[PDB]
Each structure stands twice: as structure tokens, then as C-alpha cells.
Write a protein that holds these residues in place. Structure first.
Motif, PDB file in Angstrom:
ATOM      1  N   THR A   9       0.810  -1.213   0.000  1.00  0.00           N
ATOM      2  CA  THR A   9       0.000   0.000   0.000  1.00  0.00           C
ATOM      3  C   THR A   9       0.846   1.267   0.000  1.00  0.00           C
ATOM      4  O   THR A   9       0.449   2.261  -0.618  1.00  0.00           O
ATOM      5  CB  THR A   9      -0.939  -0.003   1.208  1.00  0.00           C
ATOM      6  OG1 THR A   9      -1.522  -1.304   1.356  1.00  0.00           O
ATOM      7  CG2 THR A   9      -2.051   1.016   1.021  1.00  0.00           C
ATOM      8  N   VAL A  10       1.994   1.258   0.664  1.00  0.00           N
ATOM      9  CA  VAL A  10       2.890   2.408   0.720  1.00  0.00           C
ATOM     10  C   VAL A  10       4.009   2.183  -0.291  1.00  0.00           C
ATOM     11  O   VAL A  10       4.797   1.242  -0.131  1.00  0.00           O
ATOM     12  CB  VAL A  10       3.457   2.621   2.132  1.00  0.00           C
ATOM     13  CG1 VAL A  10       4.466   3.758   2.127  1.00  0.00           C
ATOM     14  CG2 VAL A  10       2.336   2.911   3.113  1.00  0.00           C
ATOM     15  N   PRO A  11       4.111   2.996  -1.337  1.00  0.00           N
ATOM     16  CA  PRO A  11       5.231   2.865  -2.271  1.00  0.00           C
ATOM     17  C   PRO A  11       6.488   3.539  -1.744  1.00  0.00           C
ATOM     18  O   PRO A  11       6.439   4.438  -0.903  1.00  0.00           O
ATOM     19  CB  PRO A  11       4.716   3.570  -3.530  1.00  0.00           C
ATOM     20  CG  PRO A  11       3.788   4.607  -2.998  1.00  0.00           C
ATOM     21  CD  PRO A  11       3.141   4.015  -1.775  1.00  0.00           C
TER      22      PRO A  11
ATOM     23  N   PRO C   6      -6.264  -1.684  -2.211  1.00  0.00           N
ATOM     24  CA  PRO C   6      -6.230  -0.890  -0.970  1.00  0.00           C
ATOM     25  C   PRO C   6      -5.935   0.584  -1.186  1.00  0.00           C
ATOM     26  O   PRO C   6      -6.319   1.408  -0.347  1.00  0.00           O
ATOM     27  CB  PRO C   6      -5.121  -1.569  -0.155  1.00  0.00           C
ATOM     28  CG  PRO C   6      -5.049  -2.954  -0.692  1.00  0.00           C
ATOM     29  CD  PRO C   6      -5.359  -2.844  -2.151  1.00  0.00           C
ATOM     30  N   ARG C   7      -5.267   0.945  -2.283  1.00  0.00           N
ATOM     31  CA  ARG C   7      -4.926   2.341  -2.528  1.00  0.00           C
ATOM     32  C   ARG C   7      -6.148   3.198  -2.830  1.00  0.00           C
ATOM     33  O   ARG C   7      -6.059   4.428  -2.760  1.00  0.00           O
ATOM     34  CB  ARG C   7      -3.931   2.442  -3.681  1.00  0.00           C
ATOM     35  CG  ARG C   7      -2.494   2.169  -3.287  1.00  0.00           C
ATOM     36  CD  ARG C   7      -1.869   3.389  -2.642  1.00  0.00           C
ATOM     37  NE  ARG C   7      -1.135   4.199  -3.606  1.00  0.00           N
ATOM     38  CZ  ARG C   7      -0.631   5.398  -3.348  1.00  0.00           C
ATOM     39  NH1 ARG C   7      -0.756   5.960  -2.157  1.00  0.00           N
ATOM     40  NH2 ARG C   7       0.011   6.052  -4.311  1.00  0.00           N
ATOM     41  N   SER C  10      -7.332   4.834   0.838  1.00  0.00           N
ATOM     42  CA  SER C  10      -6.464   5.736   1.582  1.00  0.00           C
ATOM     43  C   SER C  10      -5.242   6.096   0.748  1.00  0.00           C
ATOM     44  O   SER C  10      -4.799   5.331  -0.111  1.00  0.00           O
ATOM     45  CB  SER C  10      -6.020   5.118   2.914  1.00  0.00           C
ATOM     46  OG  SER C  10      -5.217   3.972   2.696  1.00  0.00           O
ATOM     47  N   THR C  12      -1.217   7.899   1.173  1.00  0.00           N
ATOM     48  CA  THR C  12      -0.123   8.336   2.031  1.00  0.00           C
ATOM     49  C   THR C  12       0.687   9.405   1.303  1.00  0.00           C
ATOM     50  O   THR C  12       1.076   9.224   0.144  1.00  0.00           O
ATOM     51  CB  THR C  12       0.744   7.148   2.470  1.00  0.00           C
ATOM     52  OG1 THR C  12       1.710   7.579   3.437  1.00  0.00           O
ATOM     53  CG2 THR C  12       1.435   6.453   1.302  1.00  0.00           C
TER      54      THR C  12
END
Lengths: 50, 48, 50, 48
Positions: A9-11, C6-7, C10, C12
């Protein structure tokens, strides 16, 4: 129950920037003294035709 | 060095530095750490 | 059966800054066996209209 | 900012050479150079 599956989810943006910076140094040409050969000749049994 | 830390939860992520541990420095570290144990074992087997 | 990306829910922006979703408690829950059977019933109803 | 093992080897060799040229010497078998692990004054931290 958590950490059961890997999430993306976090790149990673720092890695992207490093990759672009590494791509910035590519060389797409070369410096030569002579050009490449474009024509070659086949010698048959003749003395004046090829 | 900040101390204003709060914690929320666990997670699992891929490792970016996965391919960096075949370098010479890590091999040397592991090799000397093994060698010290080897000398300790040899000394123990000799004295006793 | 495929879950959504999932992106979508939300985003980030920095390491410690992240947007919160309105249905976080529901999106984190997992079904039981009876609830999975109910989901199968719902899809059976959808695939045979009337 | 790298993943190539050769670059990391060069960096580590430069660090050790700089330490050696100052009159001191650092043992490579005790030097720590890693992510996900911090140790400061008898306090250990692994993966948070």
C-alpha cells in the motif's frame, strides 16, 4: 492475524528517485575512429566480376 | 534523535536491501566471527 | 473472488501522514462461515434474475 | 542511495582507510553497517 500477508500500500519514493537518477547517466552513442562496414564483396572464379 | 515516539501496530513489508548482503564486507564479518569460535573450540579441545 | 485495491480507500503523502477512511472498522473485518454462505447466496440471486 | 555491491564495498573500504589513516584502527569484525538494527550504549533494537 495481522502481518499474515505482504502489503504494498505504501510505495517507496526514494527508490524511484534513485532509479531515475541512475537512468540519467545512460549513454546512447559511441565515439569511433572508423565507421562500420556496410558493403562486402564475394570473390567468385572470375577476375573482373564480383 | 527525537524522543517523542508513539507506536501503533505491526506490519510486513518487502526488504529493499535484500541483494546487498552478498557483498565482501558481510562475508568477511561472518568469516572472522566463525574463525574466532573455531580458535576457541581448538583451545578448549587442547587444554581439556 | 477479488478484493478492491487498498490504494483506493487511503492515500499516504509522507511516511507519517495518511488519510483516514470512513469505513475503517468494516474494511478491517473478516467474514465467518455463515456470512460467506450469505455472500454466496447474494451472488446466486444476482446471477439468476427473477 | 545504491544497491550495487561494488559501490558499497568501495564505501566501506574508504571508511576503514580513513579510520586507519588517522592513527586509530577499527576491527571490521565488530563494525556495524546494517539497516533494521540499532545498538547504542548497551541498548539493542531489532525491527522496532
Amino acid at each position: 492475524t495481522a502481518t499474515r500477508e505482504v502489503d504494498f500500500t505504501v510505495p517507496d519514493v526514494q527508490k524511484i528517485l534513485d532509479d531515475i537518477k541512475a537512468l540519467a547517466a545512460e549513454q546512447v552513442y559511441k565515439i569511433v575512429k572508423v565507421p562500420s562496414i556496410s558493403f562486402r564483396h564475394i570473390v567468385m572464379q572470375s577476375r573482373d566480376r564480383v | 534523535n527525537s524522543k517523542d515516539v508513539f507506536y501503533d501496530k505491526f506490519r510486513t513489508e518487502p526488504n529493499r536491501y535484500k541483494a546487498l548482503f552478498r557483498s565482501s564486507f558481510y562475508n568477511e564479518s561472518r568469516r572472522m566471527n566463525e574463525e574466532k569460535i573455531l580458535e576457541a573450540v581448538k583451545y578448549s579441545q587442547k587444554l581439556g | 473472488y477479488i478484493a478492491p485495491n487498498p490504494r483506493i480507500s487511503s492515500i499516504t503523502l509522507t511516511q507519517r501522514i495518511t488519510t483516514t477512511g470512513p469505513f475503517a472498522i468494516l474494511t478491517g473485518s473478516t467474514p465467518t462461515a455463515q456470512q460467506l454462505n450469505d455472500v454466496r447466496k447474494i451472488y446466486l440471486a444476482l446471477m439468476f434474475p427473477g | 542511495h545504491t544497491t550495487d555491491t561494488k559501490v558499497f564495498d568501495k564505501v566501506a573500504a574508504s571508511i576503514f582507510d580513513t579510520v586507519a589513516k588517522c592513527g586509530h584502527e577499527a576491527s571490521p569484525s565488530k563494525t556495524m553497517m546494517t539497516p533494521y538494527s540499532v545498538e547504542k550504549t548497551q541498548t539493542h533494537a531489532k525491527q522496532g
